[PDB]
Design a protein around this nucleic acid. Structure first.
Ligand code: 3HE
Lengths: 52, 102, 51, 42
RNA sequence: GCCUCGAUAGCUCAGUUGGGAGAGCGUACGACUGAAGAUCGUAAGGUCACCAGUUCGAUCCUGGUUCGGGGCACCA
RNA sequence: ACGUUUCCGACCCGUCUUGAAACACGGAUUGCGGAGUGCUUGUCUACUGCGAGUCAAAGGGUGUUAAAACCUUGCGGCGAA
RNA sequence: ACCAUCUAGUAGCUGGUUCCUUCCGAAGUUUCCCUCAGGAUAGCUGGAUCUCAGGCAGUUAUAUUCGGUAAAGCUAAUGAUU
RNA sequence: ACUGAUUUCUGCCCAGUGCUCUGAAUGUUAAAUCGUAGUAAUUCGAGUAAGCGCGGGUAAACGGCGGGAGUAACUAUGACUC
RNA sequence: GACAUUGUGAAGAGUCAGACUCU
RNA sequence: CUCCUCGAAGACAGUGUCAAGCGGGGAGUUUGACUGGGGCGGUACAUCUAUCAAAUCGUAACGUAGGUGUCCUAAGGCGAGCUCAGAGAGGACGGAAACCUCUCGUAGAGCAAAAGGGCAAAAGCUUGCUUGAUCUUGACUUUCAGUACGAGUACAGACCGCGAAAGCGUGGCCUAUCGAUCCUUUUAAUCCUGAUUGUUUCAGGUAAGAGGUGUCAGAAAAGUUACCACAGGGAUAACUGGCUUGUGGCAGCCAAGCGUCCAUAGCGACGUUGCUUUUUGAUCCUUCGAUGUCGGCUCUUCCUAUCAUUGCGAAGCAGAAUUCGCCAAGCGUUGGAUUGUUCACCCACUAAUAGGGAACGUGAGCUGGGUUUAGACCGUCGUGAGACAGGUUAGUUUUACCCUACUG
RNA sequence: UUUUUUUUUU
């Protein structure tokens, strides 16, 4: 009663059933994982710029 | 594996700098009979019912992770550093030579 | 398992002695003054077979 | 019986059992100091 | 077929981490004996089964090949 | 139209199964009975009332178409850190 | 042994699971589990809808890139080989 | 408990496992007890029985009871030898 | 094996300072 | 006269409680998984390399060839200098091989280990100094559910090492070398709590390590059942049937040779092409709410790859005889000893003693000798229960009156 | 203490 039976038969069809979802367009706006020193300097710069 | 008996390394205590440390091997302390776990285990064992907790019987490890206990010579602050597994371990053994006959 | 014959012998059921026709227990006379300070004469009236 | 069973009629274990064995196990030569035919006086 | 074990003088068996190849019998020489045998004093002796690798160096450690030997080979 | 006769089509249902008409299992026939429920606790959803509040418990007062309905909470639950 | 009760004992297993129309409509695949007749997990599916009114596409074009299979080569390295 | 009339016999092995007998045996041993430290919980140490471990016996107790070479005036075999 | 049931006398040894411990 | 009824033992025994030893006599429970059925074997269970893999990545089998549970105070870090394997040519003892010298030398060496990548003023060799193999939090990659562990990447803060400096350094040139909860234990704060107030012990907490689960996301675990049971399974074996035909059987093509000479009368090696399912295998499609599982007896029919007979052709055919071949299954293909036997072997006759199918034809046709329950014996194996396609003995063979077929 | 053998006829 062998029961390993791996396959990839219908998986592409299942994936395309609902369409392949491309990544959003705001992912490039976040500064997550950016250099800590650069982020610190950016925070200081943003804190001080005079609005008018 | 040979490890020197003295090592200059960062001191996490008051010094907050690199200082000399005497290196020894950490040995597990004797189990106290008034620890909460031992008290609970003894109370559970006492009575009728036989063994109440599993007994491990399938040892597979042939080694242990040696812990070097290093005590700073300036404030006696103590660090513990595990090293990789090794069959043989010695502290301050004879350093290896080069270009010598056997 | 079940009890062995040796274990079963102790309950004294079918393993009791068969003593319907026994003629009595073999015993000397109880110790008393005659036997302690002299002798007493008895007559052997019978010799019989005890099952 | 402790001796019962087997594809051959054999005891399988020593017939000499200790004095303090349990009621259902004390079968055979109980607390035997020796075994076999007696050669000499005894 | 599967799982193990061994292979070393002419024969039977040890041997070391890996740095010696040994023990007995056998063979050769001399001695004692009228002569042989026992006995005494000497000598020489192995395919470290074959191959490849590992390290300074392997009979040995590792892998493969040849021969021999042992155990299992059950249901129905 | 469950009558007859013609032409075409027409394998026995339920079930497990990759695959059943199966030489796979259940089923001779009919009537009646026959199987996702109750409750506690969560969560989401829909609707209703009020809304930083809301619901009020046990209880008390009343009620004789009196186990109902109606009135009643320094305090309690949830919410407000 | 038998009788009653615990007891409607538990079952990852076998069997059954009762009205009609309309619309949508799969999976036998991933990971973990004393796991392999089973579960949880993601995937596939239905429903409720809500926010809006051009940025997407199992398709092409342009531009730029990745690969070492077919073919080719050993009169080029390695390994065979007349 | 084993064997199983009569007749004739019942060989070797106490290494293993059992059973059993001695104990001087500080080898190992629980509770209790005693001593040390501490203000106390408590810590450390000493004794510490039987058993086990050491020694002996026992197989009509459970049971067990080998390999490789050479060798005889035809060959074969192997009394004999290693 | 210890404690209790468990009482009354002797001798020896050892601890102490009349007691305890043992046999 | 004596308030010991007469003796024995006697503060021991016995009794009560606790402690230790023995304790399958008895109780409860367990006795992994994968697997071309299970068992045995193996580990393909955690895991790395090359290939499979069909040019992104990904991709399976008990696929192929191998590796891992270690090793290293240096074999980590860094600075400097140097160049390796090997070849050629020279030099007392020196030889094929010791050391010295000069040329050439794209890496053909070495880098702890398996394989594959990478590396030449280095990542290799020599050497100096060192401990970045340290402390701290986040982000990310790999597996992936985009969980965890493990491993790794690029930064940020501290303190350091080497260097003149730029720089490099969080272990090993890269790809494997490893571990949850609970519990114990250690280190850390001049920390928190013990709730009648405080002090000190003790205990418990917050943070980081270690002690281990290799069935490696991590139960504490020995057998037997032929006295056996239950829920299921044709997801899964033993008998038939189905596919395949390695093996079994049968038939062809070229001719090197045999055949006194002569390859083909009759054979035919080395090669090679087919056929068949009366062998045994492979598979696991049907059947486990059952298709009665060997052989023999009995009785039909069918096929031939023709033993005999009919009609013929060819011979290494002068004839009893014998061989090959063609048309040919119309008709025959026996009696027995041994064995349960199918097979096998022998005795005898015979025209001949041909081979096979029909659910390995035929058990509501028989029989039951074998196999194949429960009783029992021996050998080997096992401590034991018990096991053994090892031997032996004894062991219940049920139902047609229905439909069809067939006979009347 | 140990101390085994001597081919056939003459
Ligand atoms: C660290 C490792 C494990 C640990 C212990 O046994 C593990 C626990 C785990 C659990 O959840 N329950 C248990 O009863 C056992 C132990 O004493 C040693 C084997 C060492």
């Amino acid at each position: 009663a062998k029961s390993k039976n791996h396959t990839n038969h219908n998986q592409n069809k299942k994936a395309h059933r609902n369409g392949i979802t491309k990544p959003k367009k705001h992912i490039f706006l976040s500064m997550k994982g950016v250099d800590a020193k650069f982020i610190k300097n950016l925070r200081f710069s943003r804190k001080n710029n005079k609005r008018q | 594996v040979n490890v020197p008996k003295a090592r200059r390394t960062f001191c996490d205590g008051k010094c907050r700098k690199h200082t000399n440390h005497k290196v020894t091997q950490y040995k597990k302390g004797k189990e106290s009979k008034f620890a909460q776990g031992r008290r609970r285990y003894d109370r559970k064992q006492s009575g009728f019912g036989g063994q109440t907790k599993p007994i491990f019987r399938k040892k597979a490890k042939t080694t242990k992770k040696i812990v070097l206990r290093m005590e700073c010579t300036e404030c006696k602050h103590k660090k513990q550093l595990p090293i990789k597994r090794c069959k043989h371990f010695e502290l301050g053994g004879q350093k290896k030579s080069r270009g010598q006959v056997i | 398992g079940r009890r062995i014959r040796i274990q079963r012998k102790g309950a004294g059921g079918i393993f009791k002695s068969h003593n319907k026709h026994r003629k009595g227990a073999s015993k000397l006379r109880p110790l008393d003054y005659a036997e302690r300070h002299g002798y007493i004469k008895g007559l052997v009236k019978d010799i019989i077979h005890d099952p | 019986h402790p001796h019962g069973g087997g594809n051959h009629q054999h005891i399988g274990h020593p017939s000499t059992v200790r004095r303090d064995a349990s009621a259902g196990k004390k079968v055979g030569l109980i607390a035997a100091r020796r075994t076999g035919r007696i050669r000499g006086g005894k």
